[PDB]
Amino acid sequence: SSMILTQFGPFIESISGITDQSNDVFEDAAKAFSMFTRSDVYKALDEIPFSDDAMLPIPPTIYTKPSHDSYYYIDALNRVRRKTYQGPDDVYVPNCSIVELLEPHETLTSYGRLSEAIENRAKDGDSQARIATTYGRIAESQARQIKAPLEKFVLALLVAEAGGSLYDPVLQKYDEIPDLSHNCPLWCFREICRHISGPLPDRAPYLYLSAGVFWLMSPRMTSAIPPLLSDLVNLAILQQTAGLDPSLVKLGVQICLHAAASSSYSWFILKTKSIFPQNTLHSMYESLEGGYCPNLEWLEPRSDYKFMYMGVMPLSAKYARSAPSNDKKARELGEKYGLSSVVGELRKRTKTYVKHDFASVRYIRDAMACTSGIFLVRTPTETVLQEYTQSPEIKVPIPQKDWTGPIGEIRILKDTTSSIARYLYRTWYLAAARMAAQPRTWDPLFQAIMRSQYVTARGGSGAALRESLYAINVSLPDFKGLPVKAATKIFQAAQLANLPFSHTSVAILADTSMGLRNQVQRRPRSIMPLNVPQQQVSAPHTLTADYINYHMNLSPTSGSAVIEKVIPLGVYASSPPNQSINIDISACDASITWDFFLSVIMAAIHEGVASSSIGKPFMGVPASIVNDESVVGVRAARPISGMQNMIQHLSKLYKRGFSYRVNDSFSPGNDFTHMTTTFPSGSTATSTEHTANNSTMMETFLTVWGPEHTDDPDVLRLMKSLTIQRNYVCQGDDGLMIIDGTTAGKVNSETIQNDLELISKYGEEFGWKYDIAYDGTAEYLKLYFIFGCRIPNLSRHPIVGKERANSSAEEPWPAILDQIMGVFFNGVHDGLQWQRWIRYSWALCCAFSRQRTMIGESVGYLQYPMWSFVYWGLPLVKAFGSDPWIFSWYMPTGDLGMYSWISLIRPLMTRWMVANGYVTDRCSTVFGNADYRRCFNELKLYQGYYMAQLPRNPKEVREQFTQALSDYLMQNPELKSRVLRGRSEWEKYGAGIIHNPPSLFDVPHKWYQGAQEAAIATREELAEMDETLMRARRHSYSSFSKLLEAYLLVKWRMCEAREPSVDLRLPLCAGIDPLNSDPFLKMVSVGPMLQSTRKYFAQTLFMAKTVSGLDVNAIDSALLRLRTLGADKKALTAQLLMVGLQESEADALAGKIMLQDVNTVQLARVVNLAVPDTWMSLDFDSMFKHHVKLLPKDGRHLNTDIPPRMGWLRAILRFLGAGMVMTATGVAVDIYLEDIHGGGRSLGQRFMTWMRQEGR
């Protein structure tokens, strides 16, 4: 596009596969991006000759909106509240005018901020002004839920799309993805915005600033415009990068337009977010006529979550959707929110898919990508008042007469009881007893670990803890003058370190400060962070819960990444013969209260733990005496253990309820403490606890309640065939009920429906509202599955979206780079069209790679070379004269990735350097006669490589602090004695061998550092970071890292492509089909990762956990390095003593390590090699084992042989080979070791040098 094509022409061709990429062009393009004014982006958009198919009616009511005033009021407690009109949910930001409340900005006369007068008038308690300030502040907060200005993302899209269709190297044809003239989201963006600016020279409807927003002073501007615009941009990019059906995309825009047309965008999106999934995913195959699905076997023990692929299951009518119909509800929702045309259009299209195949799952995926991806926002006041207000309705309470007299704070549940609580009790009692009986529980190291779990940089309600203690004349050290963020639990630990349990006890009842975090397609999550003393006392609860989840049930301990959400389980559960019910418990925290659960759980633990903990303190808490009115009449003083003493103090808090301090920053005058029985989300127990009750109640239902409430033979059979150990997987409030079918097909839908209704009624008995879904679909941990195929949900990963719950300003450049790289990796995992996605990312990165630096009137610029992004993981499109698109997005990160792409075109690079004057008489074992040193410096390859490795963020009372922390951790004398023994032992057997000895004595320093890096950076500090970056760019190098220089000595031969590991007609991941060549062939040739990645990697460490503050992978690395470096057994023993272990254990594990055959992944850590995040979804284990041959294609070579004592080389060598195979576009190929320049022996010594030199 002339304007665009004129300014980025050369760069546009370098990322389209037409021209080689070069830092000169990359950086020129970067300069061009930064010099582009916002209005120019809109002018560029004006040049696009949009097509009629990219247009649709834009509701005039989007622009003319009411005054915010009728949407708020002042309540009885003088809190600015949101006035409700559409219902209990209608509490978000309303769609109203905004210009009347702003004062023009000094320099940007066309933009304005909330009037200083209104705010000050609000600070002065005026009611009308408080309301206007609230609305103004919350509208802004809504507009800030993005990573950066939308104009950056649009400009990047224009620049990358000007490259036109992309030629697929494998399919050997150009893609047929429509050009921007057909992009309805973009057309809307341009039109809506143009209509708003009107005659104004400024085209941007609002400006996204570092801490706030300014709105274009147009009477046509609305508080709903930013969210609307943000959705459009995402949809614009996804249509070009995921190849989304343009027609499905228009439906999505329609929905957003309707949201802006309503009285509240966020609210409208919340009420209609189910449209696309319900009418596609949840209504597929009413008529199944064919296609294939996975046939997996769930290996034993089912708890390993390991699966094996056995082939494909031919689909027929026998498998058509049998679950309840949702047509009625689906159409009702549409009719009610003015979207029936969209519902019906979606229903009509869905019924046309009578075969389950790539085409159909892609259809679902596409549809599901259209849902708004905004991070919903509302004031903290509103979140508090809605999420902490109502308790659960216990329909069948525990009889009052079923409790004994008190034993301190608790009451025992009689065994006479008829309550079903009876079972909840036994289970926790049992677990507590076995937990407490474990010898490890009484190991000082174990207790240090439990005491360190909550010693972090995160807040722990510091202010309130200091006040509760102040009220009893217990003043904590201030550490006046220490450069650390005081509002951290690490700081809290330091303050409490030398105080007895008895002095801080009262803090257990102190207020809890509320936090907040916004979510996509969901209402705000509240964050109630307990303080150190509260977390300490919660240990018994947490431990018993872990014991249950570890020994008594089938449960996930997943994070937020797709790589750790046991994808394999979903495939299995959703694959016909099998069926899965998605069971969930809504309002979980508010349902785990004292009346039923907590009073029972506290008692069961307090009693089940009695004998094992008899006369000992625990984690710092002393034993004591409690009032005993247990047995009727008699009343004595009863001795209890430390562990019991904890439960004793915890019960008081649980029983009393929690006090949440709410400081609504967005609502002037909204400061208050709110009491509620709703469970804390920031307790070490929360998740594990909820997981334990989930499985316990489900178990009780399958064993007792259910069977006793029906005589239906079939329902009794179904129930009896299920077990929480084999058919029910849970985590927190989410659960998956997996019903293995049979040869005779799947279990009767009606029989399942009956047994689900029983579950529903059963929950009402103890206050749980089960959110059960039976729809032929599987849902668990936010991943969606149908017929064994994963459906990535693109709407949940907003490209421009970003969660900003507070008013603090965004992190300083270049933190945005990490976020952009994160956006890129989401695309890889979500399976976007690889070429279009790669090209786009390059444009996006380039658009953020340049930042203006100020140094006292000296205007300069920080510039990250294109090579820094390669290092971070972004694959090259074409360089050094190579063919285009030969590099896959599965190229590893850092050194391993650098090694991979370089090895792929090494000869080419050499040939290119000479052809361009980079020649020397000096011959290189890697680049021959190529003057690589002068080449890599001139094209900033070394600079980018080294710049990519710098931090992207600024960085007597000292002895006192570190010492306090030290006392906290080294509380128990036995632990210290262990570490010291290790130290004097390290001198004799380990010192000199390695210099990276991990040690408990390090924790205090690691913690101090953490409390420091948590504080806010100073202006000067930011400068030092920039200067560090500029220094690295100005310096000239002569080599890469020592490890990379060593890998480059290794050469390979790529041979025969691998045979398919799975059927080519089999849909595993929607979007990953024959139309997405690289990802598809990789999936097919390599094969999917069929085991939980947590369970897999948990097998690559000698020790699962350690003190919070040390790295388990680091300890595992130190041990393995000492072994490799020839150190003696006693040296590993010394290392293990320094990390808290007992001599007996130390000597044993150490002796075990000396003789163990370490697997590829675990041993590879000796040189810091890690399995790439992007590979986690594929069967990398198989690649290392059977597809990276270390015996040259034609036999043994002198240089390839592995020296007798260097068998550990094979591990490292496997990673290098796999690196090249995965980085090469197309099918995974068998790679064969061809050469090692100086031979294996010389190579091993080279790595040993690196090993012993670390931290020197």
Ligand SMILES: C[n+]1cn([C@@H]2O[C@H](COP(=O)(O)OP(=O)(O)OP(=O)(O)OC[C@H]3O[C@@H](n4cnc5c(=O)[nH]c(N)nc54)[C@H](O)[C@@H]3O)[C@@H](O)[C@H]2O)c2nc(N)[nH]c(=O)c21
């Ligand atoms: C000053 N500074 C800002 N950020 C970050 O910038 C953001 C908000 O800032 P802002 O309004 O203060 O920053 P400006 O980017 O500079 O806005 P701006 O008005 O954007 O840039 C000014 C003008 O420079 C012009 N320009 C850009 N590139 C070039 C170029 O290559 N050559 C020439 N001749 N002009 C250029 C262009 O006209 C443009 O309007 C913050 O959030 C920070 O994170 C910094 N980050 C680091 N590490 N170090 C810094 O010294 C620094």
Ligand SMILES: [Mn+2]
């Ligand atoms: Mn669920």
